Amino acid sequence: RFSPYVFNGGTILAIAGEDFAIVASDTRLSEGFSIHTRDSPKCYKLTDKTVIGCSGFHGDCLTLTKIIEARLKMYKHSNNKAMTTGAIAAMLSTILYSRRFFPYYVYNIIGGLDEEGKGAVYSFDPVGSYQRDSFKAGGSASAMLQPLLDNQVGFKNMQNVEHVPLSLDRAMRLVKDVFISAAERDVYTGDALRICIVTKEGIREETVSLRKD
Amino acid sequence: NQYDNDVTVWSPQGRIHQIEYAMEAVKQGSATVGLKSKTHAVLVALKRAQSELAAHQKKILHVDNHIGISIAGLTADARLLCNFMRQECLDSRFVFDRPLPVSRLVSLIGSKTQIPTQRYGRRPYGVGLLIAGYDDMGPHIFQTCPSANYFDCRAMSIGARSQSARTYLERHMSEFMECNLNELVKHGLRALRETLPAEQDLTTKNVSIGIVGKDLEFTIYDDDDVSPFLEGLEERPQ
Amino acid sequence: YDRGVNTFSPEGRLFQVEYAIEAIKLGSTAIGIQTSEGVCLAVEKRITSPLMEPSSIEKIVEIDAHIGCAMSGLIADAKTLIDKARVETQNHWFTYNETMTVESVTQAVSNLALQFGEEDSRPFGVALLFGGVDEKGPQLFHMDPSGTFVQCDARAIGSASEGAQSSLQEVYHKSMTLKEAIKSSLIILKQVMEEKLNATNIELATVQPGQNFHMFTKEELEEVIKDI
Amino acid sequence: TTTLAFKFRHGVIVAADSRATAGAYIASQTVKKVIEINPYLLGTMAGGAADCSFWERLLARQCRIYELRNKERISVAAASKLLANMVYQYKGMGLSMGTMICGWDKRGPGLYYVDSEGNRISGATFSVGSGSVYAYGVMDRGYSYDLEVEQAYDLARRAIYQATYRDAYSGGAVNLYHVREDGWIRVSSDNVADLHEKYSG
Amino acid sequence: MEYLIGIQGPDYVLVASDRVAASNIVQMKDDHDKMFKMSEKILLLCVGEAGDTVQFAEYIQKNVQLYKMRNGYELSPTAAANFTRRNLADCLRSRTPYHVNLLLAGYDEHEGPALYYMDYLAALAKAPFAAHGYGAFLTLSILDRYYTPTISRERAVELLRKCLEELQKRFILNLPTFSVRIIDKNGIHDLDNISFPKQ
Amino acid sequence: SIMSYNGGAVMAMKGKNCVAIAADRRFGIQAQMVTTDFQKIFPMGDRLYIGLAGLATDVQTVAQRLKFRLNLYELKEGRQIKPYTLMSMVANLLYEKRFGPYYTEPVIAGLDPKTFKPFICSLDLIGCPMVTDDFVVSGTCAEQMYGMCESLWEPNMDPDHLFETISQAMLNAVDRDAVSGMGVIVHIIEKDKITTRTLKARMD
Amino acid sequence: SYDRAITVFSPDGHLFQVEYAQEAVKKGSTAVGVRGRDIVVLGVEKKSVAKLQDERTVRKICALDDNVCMAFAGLTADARIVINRARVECQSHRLTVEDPVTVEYITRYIASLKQRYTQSNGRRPFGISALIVGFDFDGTPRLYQTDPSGTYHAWKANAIGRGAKSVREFLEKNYTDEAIETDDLTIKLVIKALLEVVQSGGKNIELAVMRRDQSLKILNPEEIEKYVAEIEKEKEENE
Amino acid sequence: RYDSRTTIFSPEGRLYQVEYAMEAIGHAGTCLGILANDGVLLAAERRNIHKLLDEVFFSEKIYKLNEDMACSVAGITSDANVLTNELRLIAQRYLLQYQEPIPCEQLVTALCDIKQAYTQFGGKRPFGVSLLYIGWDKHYGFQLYQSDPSGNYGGWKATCIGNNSAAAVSMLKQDYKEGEMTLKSALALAIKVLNKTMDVSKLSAEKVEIATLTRENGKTVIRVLKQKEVEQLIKKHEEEEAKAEREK
């Protein structure tokens, strides 16, 4: 009989900097044991200071993206201003709970700048609970990225090591190293790496190739 | 005088007076002038103060990234049509993932305003909408009326004493297709200064200018950015 | 043709909402002044009886913990408008984790006052003054039964409305302070009311950026009056 | 997941862990499981993340309107009753909610327990969570109504530590709040690994 | 799971319940009350699900008080008992069935004392004694042994104490304390609480 | 089953100029009795009774709904109800719950209001009327009640022997049943009077 | 000229059909009420029994809940709907929120139910005015009043009915800032206030008090006759 | 004027449509109930007793309604059949709910809330029907009540109808009894009151109607007493006139 859900894969990474935010994802879209395309990024520029990532079931990712982009315009003409980073995370929690008994199969991470100019990363669940974190990794390779970033960013289980804040250039090579190691052991990850950098001067993009198998 | 009570009642001359009276509410509001070139469509309005120290009431309001409208008439019918206007613009973005053609959005307004001009229980909308936009075939200047007719035009002025603005537009409409924005805007606001009593001048605090372009999103300038537009003007020949 | 909200005039107009503007005129006076240090606000009580309990007559209500209010005209329609104005600021915080701005409060209020005959009743009989300090600083707004919404720098409505405006436009300027605008406001009040001004005829309400509390004065009002 | 609450002579003590998992996978270690409803009310999170997050935020939406319409704070028994009726309309549809309500009232302290099944009971001591049953024994061995303030801080900090030791779904940090007559106050937030060097030494 | 008892006398009704609010292993509350004063001569005992006990019995509680304030006088215990049966049976073939077990205790000025039994399928009865829960099995044959229709109110308390000691002996659950009421021509009087030193 | 949740037995029997009806007294859940004074025979006007058996909820429910419709019938019309008319009334009430049905099987016994003519009938749980001339039975122990009535019934019987036949039919059949008993009440009516007797049965 | 509608305005901004509803209040029997230290009291006048009827069905003083009272004016039909509706709300409040109902909450329900009942055409408004007296909200004595426009309002001493202007002017010169303690003194204030009745027969006063802890205590025409005697005892000092 | 729908109020200020209905009942039949210990009675009048009718029901003014209550009727007959079918349907809804009869007061207020509700909602007439009430209950015994078009009511011990027979109320006070209120003492009072108010002399039995309600062995029988015993009740009163003239 008909089943309404299917898994598509994907891996999303976000790191809250001191005055920046980095959002990274792969561009591989798959289903079962087939590859649909090798060019399908998960980054979405909502505003000039907020980028969202959407993994999971791809049909709900296309729907939920267009609902949020409609409500950005509905906020603005009612208030003569744009939404903040924390306002979007409060709005998204009500949208995800609004279909509590038929849930979206989407994992969400919002990264961007606050009103003070600092980094902010909000992680989500498919029902709508959230919290502010410093770094999260969502998607199929989520278990292969969280223990390594605890060592390098959070400095957990380390002795006699000072807590220097992560610079921008050091954070770029940490993102480029975790996706090489994750594409080796995971099958839902590869073919590119789209990286979005959110600073006070706009949004930069950068693409790094991976292995194509 | 007994025929002059409802929208339903026809006259023995064949003219419904309630539609004829909603035209008179358009003449209560202030004047506003819209025009276009081959590439750029600019509509310019005129603010009116309420008191000596209250803020001036706004006229031009943003609708979409390629559509902006002016206003003349009742403020109750103004925001009631705006909420119908904004809902239709984002439905084509949500369904078709394209912006609306401007010529077919206004046909939805004439279907919207037709029902309260025929069925009893709702007055006609007293409103004077001027519409500027961009479909795939260039700029457009549209007007509506409470008789639910919509007129495509290349220049139009409606509101209080706007007949003197129409006379300026007819003898300069041959020049509008070629000139660019540095004078096309101040071709338009030379038409507003005949809709004024001859002793005061169009200042920076009582005028709004909205520009939508072929490569330019619809932008509203008011009270600070009008000064690069009001520079380089002559006075009235008094 | 002057007894219907569904009927125009040969000249304009209504002829129904114009009569609703007249219902404000038989109210009580109220003065609000916007200043860069904050927004002060004054009103007249018109207490009828000594047995009449004074704090049951409201003229300043607290819409939110950074937004005050003032009213005149019909009391019965006023309590309807204050109700959703408290709810719409509360629904916005529920879905956005932020305080609704003072301008966008009245956007929600004006969306229902222009629904008197425009559904598928009568218009209201009450003007409102909204003062508050949002992220754009201190603000002061004004509405009417016709839904016409505007920002004012210093506004006086109710009875004695036009007579207050002429004297109020004389002394206002941009570089006022808050403590100057408070004593400037009730010089106008004792010139427009008929009873002798004391601590029981009026009441005050202020709002400040860092002092979002205290939209009321509790017998510090006696100190202001004794130094007039 | 392990929360507890107990009232005594000087108010109410609230304590919880900070670990939220997903199957056998730990999602985070910094989950704030005590939801700050008001400056005079506190709520907990026990069973379901978004279910305890939404409905207590909807309760905080309701208690503010009650304060504006009546010029008075809401009572503790009133807010626990309003939460019980909202969840009961979705009975059987599959909610999970086991929160607690704390706060000072005109009658004094206040402590109620609300389930998603429909149980609304008062009491003096409670402990909710997967590792809740490890916390009843160590608390009741040291509980008294006439405990001191610094003594009550060490009792709840001990009881969360013994619960996170035996349970696998409990760990992270130990939050600790104190409800005073005027309003609640945040006491501290201590890591479990810091307490292990203190308690075993 | 929890226990009720319904000893009826010639001019009195002796009722008692337990004080346990357990959660599946633990005992969260040991002074819980299951006694609902419907009026000045009518009590209510309720045993059932988690939420269905509080929601339904308070719906009856705040509906008999409406009859008192509006008509100036009080319901009889028979009419009050036969209104509770109407609300289960009407709300039984629907999406929300209430799963509670009740017994009603009332005194009438014209009919004397009365006791009514209630199933979770809304079946009325008129019993000289009744009980509920798993402890209803072990205790009612003791009460069937020594019952007399003309019994004093002092022997009924002694018969109630005989009825509860065997529930202390051969019943697996703990159940330490038991609150006791009594209803007569004067009203509802609260007797002393019953506890058990086991060993 | 659902019918076997509380038990019950209702028997009616036609005589010469009279008619009798009998039922049990036991009320109880599946194996545990509660009381021995549960009414299962309800008067609906003079010289006309009705008996109900099945689920104890629908026994008390239908007997109140039928009383609701009977009093509204006997006030719009000054006459009383005919025994054929009540059978059409009950069959309408059961068929409205065609797919939500009440779990009972009614037995109607009574005399004609004008003449002396008796009447007996029984219905199903969805309203199939069935009139006979000798006896109708309903309840859980139905098969035992057919074995007694097919051998003891005589066509033209005085109220003396009609009472003795329905007594021996109820006692010997219900004592074979497990979930029915604890007392038997017998109504025997006629043109002149109504006699109600209770029998000495086994209380186990 | 123009009234004949509750939705139209006057050329000077009035609602005459709302104002005509207050004219129907002035055809009613007067009822007064004061608050005191602990004991609140309210009394009514103009019983006027007509020799052939039972007098327990003409009662003007009812209780909504266990600790709130009610006295009204106007016409008897519209009061019965408002009383029967308010008993439901002061009981359904207790079900949704387990507190007892404050005296302030029930007056907002009566005013708001009379509010929306004025707005829509084809709905004749209530021609009654009510007095809500209750020392319920945590030991604090209060009394409010209503209005056919739908404006709940708080006084400290009140008079309504046919002749309220004389009594309200009487109480302003009589209600001392000295709080009337020794509550029979406060009851004697009402009997002195109700002494200015439309005829002042003496035996046409039905005073009902409440000691803020017990239920309603309807006074008998023997205890009230004793208070009428001591009012004449203080009147002997005029000579 | 102000003779529009029931909404609105008049100025100064009252309700003209309600007043028009309350005057209409004076041009109707005549009904009265009297005091009685251990009983209660009703008395009515047969209008238009023309000799080509059947009277197949033999009860026209009186409608037995629950089991121990009946009612008279006075007013528009089109609205009369609506109320009686509604009022019987109230008492069975109460009986289905509590399994106890309706206690004779809140039945009256249940109708009076229906009769009021047509005075505020537009656009309807009010009911142009006033009617009486007799009954027995557990709490107060024998009772009398008086309906009005406005929904107002009131208990009584003896009452009647207006502009037809408003002078009877003066006779009920002048010949009032209290305590000595047996049924035979009240039936003699009933035929004397209907003698003057019904202006047709000598009081033929086909123009009147008498219904009683007693309390017998806990059953509360209701008697609509037949025309044969009306005869010996009238001739008793005709004899008392010939006895009363001995003082002359």
UniProtKB/Swiss-Prot annotation, chain A:
Lineage: Eukaryota, Metazoa, Chordata, Craniata, Vertebrata
GO biological process annotation, one example: proteolysis involved in protein catabolic process
Highest rank taxon of the organism: Eukaryota
UniProt cross-references to PANTHER family, sorted A to Z: METALLOPROTEASE TLDD, PROTEASOME SUBUNIT BETA TYPE-1
Disease as annotated in the protein's UniProt record: Neurodevelopmental disorder with microcephaly, hypotonia, and absent language: An autosomal recessive disorder characterized by microcephaly, intellectual disability with absent speech, severe developmental delay, short stature, and hypotonia. Affected individuals also manifest aggressive behavior and have hearing loss.
Main location: cytoplasm
Modified residues (N6-acetyllysine): 176
PTM sites of type Phosphoserine: 34, 40, 134
A GO CC term attached to the entry: cytoplasm
Record localization: Cytoplasm; Nucleus
Glycosylation sites noted in the Swiss-Prot or TrEMBL record: 30, 181
Role according to the record: Non-catalytic component of the 20S core proteasome complex involved in the proteolytic degradation of most intracellular proteins. This complex plays numerous essential roles within the cell by associating with different regulatory particles. Associated with two 19S regulatory particles, forms the 26S proteasome and thus participates in the ATP-dependent degradation of ubiquitinated proteins.
SUPFAM superfamilies: N-terminal nucleophile aminohydrolases (Ntn hydrolases) (SSF56235)
Keyword hit for Thylakoid: no
Name of the protein described by the UniProt record: Proteasome subunit beta type-1
Keywords from the UniProt entry: Acetylation, Cytoplasm, Deafness, Glycoprotein, Host-virus interaction, Intellectual disability, Nucleus, Phosphoprotein, Proteasome
Curated annotation (Swiss-Prot), chain C:
Tissue: Expressed in fetal brain (at protein level).
Modified residue annotations for Phosphoserine: 9, 49, 56
Keyword annotations of the record: Acetylation, Cytoplasm, Glycoprotein, Nucleus, Phosphoprotein, Proteasome
Location relative to the cell: Cytoplasm; Nucleus
Single GO cellular component term: proteasome core complex, alpha-subunit complex
UniProt keyword Iron-sulfur, yes or no: no
Upregulation: Up-regulated in colon cancer cell lines. Up-regulated in fetal Down syndrome (DS) brain (at protein level). May be the target of the transcriptional activator NFE2L2.
Record-linked PROSITE patterns: PROTEASOME_ALPHA_1 (PS00388), PROTEASOME_ALPHA_2 (PS51475)
Phosphothreonine found at: 48
SMART domains, per the entry: Proteasome_A_N
Function, as annotated: Component of the 20S core proteasome complex involved in the proteolytic degradation of most intracellular proteins. This complex plays numerous essential roles within the cell by associating with different regulatory particles. Associated with two 19S regulatory particles, forms the 26S proteasome and thus participates in the ATP-dependent degradation of ubiquitinated proteins.
Family: Belongs to the peptidase T1A family.
Protein name: Proteasome subunit alpha type-5
Native source species: Homo sapiens (Human)
Name of the gene: PSMA5
From Swiss-Prot, chain F:
Main location: cytoplasm
Any single GO BP term: proteasome-mediated ubiquitin-dependent protein catabolic process
Modified residues (N-acetylserine): 1
Positions where N6-acetyllysine occurs in the chain: 76
Chain coiled-coil ranges: none
Domain of life of the native organism: Eukaryota
Compartments reported by the entry: Cytoplasm; Nucleus
Pfam families the UniProt entry points to: Proteasome (PF00227)
Induction behaviour: Up-regulated in asthenozoospermic sperm.
Keywords assigned: Acetylation, Cytoplasm, Host-virus interaction, Nucleus, Proteasome
CDD domains: proteasome_beta_type_3
Keyword Cytoplasm appears in the UniProt entry: yes
CC terms in the record's Gene Ontology section: cytoplasm; cytosol; extracellular exosome; nucleoplasm; nucleus; proteasome complex; proteasome core complex; proteasome core complex, beta-subunit complex
SUPFAM superfamilies tied to this protein: N-terminal nucleophile aminohydrolases (Ntn hydrolases)
Family: Belongs to the peptidase T1B family.
Assembly and interaction partners: The 26S proteasome consists of a 20S proteasome core and two 19S regulatory subunits. The 20S proteasome core is a barrel-shaped complex made of 28 subunits that are arranged in four stacked rings. The two outer rings are each formed by seven alpha subunits, and the two inner rings are formed by seven beta subunits. The proteolytic activity is exerted by three beta-subunits PSMB5, PSMB6 and PSMB7.
Name recorded for this polypeptide: Proteasome subunit beta type-3
UniProtKB/Swiss-Prot annotation, chain G:
Keyword Iron-sulfur found: no
Compartmental location: Cytoplasm; Nucleus
Residues modified by glycosylation: 129
InterPro entries: Ntn_hydrolases_N, Proteasome_alpha, Proteasome_alpha-type, Proteasome_asu_N, Proteasome_sua/b
Phosphotyrosine found at: 152
Coiled-coil segments on the chain, per record: none
Description of post-translational modifications: Phosphorylation by ABL1 or ABL2 leads to an inhibition of proteasomal activity and cell cycle transition blocks.
GO cellular component: cytoplasm; cytosol; extracellular exosome; nucleoplasm; nucleus; proteasome complex; proteasome core complex; proteasome core complex, alpha-subunit complex
Keywords: Acetylation, Cytoplasm, Glycoprotein, Host-virus interaction, Nucleus, Phosphoprotein, Proteasome
Positions of modified residues (N6-acetyllysine): 226
Entry keyword Nucleus: yes
Gene3D superfamilies noted in UniProt: Glutamine Phosphoribosylpyrophosphate, subunit 1, domain 1
Induction details: Down-regulated by the ribozyme Rz3'X. Up-regulated in colorectal cancer tissues.
Molecular function as annotated in GO: identical protein binding
CDD domains membership: proteasome_alpha_type_7
Single Gene Ontology BP annotation: proteasome-mediated ubiquitin-dependent protein catabolic process
Function recorded in the entry: Component of the 20S core proteasome complex involved in the proteolytic degradation of most intracellular proteins. This complex plays numerous essential roles within the cell by associating with different regulatory particles. Associated with two 19S regulatory particles, forms the 26S proteasome and thus participates in the ATP-dependent degradation of ubiquitinated proteins.
PANTHER family named among the record's database cross-references: PROTEASOME SUBUNIT ALPHA/BETA (PTHR11599)
Family: Belongs to the peptidase T1A family.
Protein name: Proteasome subunit alpha type-7
